[PDB]
């Protein structure tokens, strides 16, 4: 049942093709461990708030990364103005950084090339965001 409902979430409520679902379960089976609801939130974060499409999600294994890390980096970029949610037309004033540049890279290169900020600033932002999530709950 757990496997079936994970796959059904990936297909029905996430609109991943069958081949995409096999690719996800092949690259990162940790999705199966990850509980429903949290997985749906992660995918919708990629889709709506981040503006990523299924091909890119699967290509970058976005589902592999943790939601806390994903938020910590994306919200930092967004508030910094280096990342913009694509509009209704799917366009942005400035091209967004690539997901490989956002999540795959380490904190050093992430803050040096994509954000161009300081590690201390990033730590402060991470703590602030943790407090924000705590308050939101």
């Amino acid at each position: 049942q757990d496997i079936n409902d994970t796959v059904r979430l990936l297909k029905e409520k996430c609109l991943f093709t069958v081949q995409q679902v096999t690719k996800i379960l092949h690259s990162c089976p940790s999705v199966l461990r990850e509980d429903l609801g949290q997985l749906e939130y992660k995918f919708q974060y990629a889709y709506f708030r981040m503006g990523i499409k299924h091909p890119d999600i699967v290509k970058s294994e976005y589902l592999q990364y943790s939601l806390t890390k994903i938020k910590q980096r994306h919200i930092y970029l967004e508030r910094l103005g280096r990342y913009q949610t694509p509009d209704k037309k799917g366009q942005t004033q400035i091209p967004n950084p690539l997901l490989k540049d956002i999540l795959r890279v380490s904190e050093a290169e992430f803050l040096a090339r994509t954000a161009c900020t300081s590690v201390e600033e990033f730590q402060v932002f991470k703590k602030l965001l943790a407090r924000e999530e705590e308050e939101s709950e």
């Binding site: 508030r79 103005g81 900020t117 201390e120 602030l128």
Partner: protein
């Protein structure tokens, strides 16, 4: 009325409209500092704690220091040459416990933006100096001025009866009956633009905190957001009101007296053009000369607690930073030479 239209505007919320305005202006203004300022504005705000000099000041300072906050004000007057505001170290995000009524019956401390205290410390309140607050009635700087000495007289004016009532509330909460009833505190609700005529060359130290775009609160709160599309006309006329209020303050201050123009916005338009236009208008329409006093020493003194934008030629700009989310705050010191 024409019901159907070919195209309608996107219908942005006021917060997003303010963000777009800031992105299109402050980005140019600040270059590479704009992303940092933007993230600081969008993140939480760092609140300083101003102890109430009319309460158990030593006990409250001890409690805050136990909470590990330090009085940045204390170790600043030494180099600059009663006010005590405790703030956490750069990078620390620790909050201050909510203020509670003290043993004397007054609130122990006021949680206020530490940036909205530099204008007070730069006005240079000398003992026995008559003080005016032309429009500053959010509390804040006003209460800071009040908690400066027991041998000084201060008047606070603001057109808005609601804001005057707010000042009264904080006064009853913090200022004791002795000082509040005494003439030391004189509150009024009149128009500052005509304050030059109402009183001229009367006050020695003036604080003109003109109504501003209050960028941080504009991004935070949707209610009464100055950047709502309908209220564009008021937004556009804000510079005129700011110039008029600063001119009224410069007229009311005594010859040789001092004024501090204050703003809670990053806009160069509302920061430096306001002061320059006020100087020009008040030197032509009134033939009164005003000199802008340097605060570079003040900048260096408070560099540790605040980050300042240096490119601003006139005045001082506390820009918010993630390490110290205290800004924004623009303040300019002006001495009336005639």
């Amino acid at each position: 009325y024409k019901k159907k239209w070919a195209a309608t505007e996107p219908k942005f919320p006021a917060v997003r409209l303010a963000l777009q305005n800031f992105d299109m202006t402050y980005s140019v203004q600040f270059g590479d500092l704009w992303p940092s300022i933007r993230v600081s504005l969008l993140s939480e705000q760092k609140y300083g704690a101003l102890v109430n000099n009319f309460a158990a000041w030593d006990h409250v300072s001890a409690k805050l220091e136990q909470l590990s906050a330090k009085d940045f004000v204390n170790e600043a007057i030494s180099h600059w040459e009663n006010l005590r505001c405790f703030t956490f170290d750069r990078g620390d995000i620790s909050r201050f416990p909510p203020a509670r009524p003290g043993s004397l019956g007054v609130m122990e401390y006021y949680l206020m933006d530490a940036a909205s205290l530099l204008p007070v410390l730069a006005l240079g309140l000398q003992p026995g100096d008559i003080v005016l607050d032309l429009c500053a009635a959010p509390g804040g700087k006003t209460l800071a001025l009040l908690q400066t000495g027991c041998c000084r007289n201060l008047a606070a004016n603001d057109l808005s009866p609601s804001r005057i009532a707010r000042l009264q509330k904080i006064l009853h909460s913090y200022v004791p009956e002795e000082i509040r009833d005494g003439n030391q505190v004189r509150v009024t609700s009149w128009d500052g633009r005509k304050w030059g005529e109402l009183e001229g060359d009367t006050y020695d130290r003036v604080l003109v905190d003109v109504p501003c775009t209050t960028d941080r609160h504009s991004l935070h709160e949707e209610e009464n957001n100055i950047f709502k599309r309908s209220r564009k006309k008021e937004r556009q006329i804000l510079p005129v009101l700011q110039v008029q209020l600063l001119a009224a303050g410069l007229l009311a201050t005594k010859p040789g007296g001092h004024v501090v123009y204050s703003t809670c916005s990053l806009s160069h338009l509302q920061n430096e053009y306001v002061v320059q236009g006020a100087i020009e208008l008040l030197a032509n329409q009134y033939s009164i000369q005003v000199q802008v006093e340097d605060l570079t020493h003040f900048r260096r003194v408070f560099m540790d607690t605040f980050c300042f934008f240096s490119s601003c030629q006139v005045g001082e700009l506390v820009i918010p930073n993630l390490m110290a989310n205290f800004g924004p705050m623009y303040f300019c010191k002006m001495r009336r030479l005639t």
